[PDB]
Ligand binder design. Structure first.
Ligand SMILES: Cc1noc(C)c1-c1ccc2c(c1)nc(CCc1ccccc1)n2CCN1CCOCC1
Ligand SMILES: [K+]
Length: 125
C-alpha cells in the first residue's frame, strides 16, 4: 500500500492562543532541530513508497515528523505546549520502534533527541 494522509495541521473548531512557550518551541526548539545536520529525514512524513518500506504503516500507526510539528506551530494548532513536546517524543519513539539499534537513522534520532532535551530544558515559564 501507499502512504496515509499526513497528520492534521489545522483544526478550525479549536480555539487558538499565542504564548511565550509556544513561540519558543517554534523559534528556538523547532528551528534548532530543523537546521541540524541530521534533520532532513525527519522534515516530512516518512514516505514508504519512495523509501520502499512496505511494512512501515503496518508497524507505525501514530506517525509524526517535524514538517507536521512546524506547520502545527505556524497554524497555532497547539493550545498546550505539552501537545508539541508529545509530538516530538512520538517522532523519536517511532524511529526506535521501526528500526534497529545502531542503524544510521537511529543514531540521527538519538542526536536530535539529545539536542531537543537540551532545548526543552530552557523552555521559558
Ligand atoms: C525517519 C525514519 N523512520 O524510519 C525510517 C526508515 C526513516 C528514514 C530513514 C532514512 C531516510 C528517511 C527516513 N528520509 C530520508 C531522506 C529523504 C528521502 C530520500 C529518498 C526518498 C524519500 C525521502 N532518508 C535517507 C534515505 N537514503 C536512501 C538512499 O540511501 C541512503 C539513505
Ligand atoms: K479563538
Amino acid at each position: 500500500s501507499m502512504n496515509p494522509p499526513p497528520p492534521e495541521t489545522s483544526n478550525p473548531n479549536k480555539p487558538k492562543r499565542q504564548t511565550n512557550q509556544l513561540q519558543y518551541l517554534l523559534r528556538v526548539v523547532l528551528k534548532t532541530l530543523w537546521k541540524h545536520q541530521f534533520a532532513w529525514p525527519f522534515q516530512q512524513p516518512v514516505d514508504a513508497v519512495k523509501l520502499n518500506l512496505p511494512d512501515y504503516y503496518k508497524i507505525i500507526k501514530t506517525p509524526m515528523d517535524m514538517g507536521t510539528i512546524k506547520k502545527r506551530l505556524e497554524n497555532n494548532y497547539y493550545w498546550n505546549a505539552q501537545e508539541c513536546i508529545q509530538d516530538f517524543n512520538t517522532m523519536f519513539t517511532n524511529c526506535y520502534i521501526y528500526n534497529k539499534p545502531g542503524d544510521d537513522i537511529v543514531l540521527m534520532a538519538e542526536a536530535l533527541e539529545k539536542l531537543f532535551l537540551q532545548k526543552i530544558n530552557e523552555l521559558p515559564t
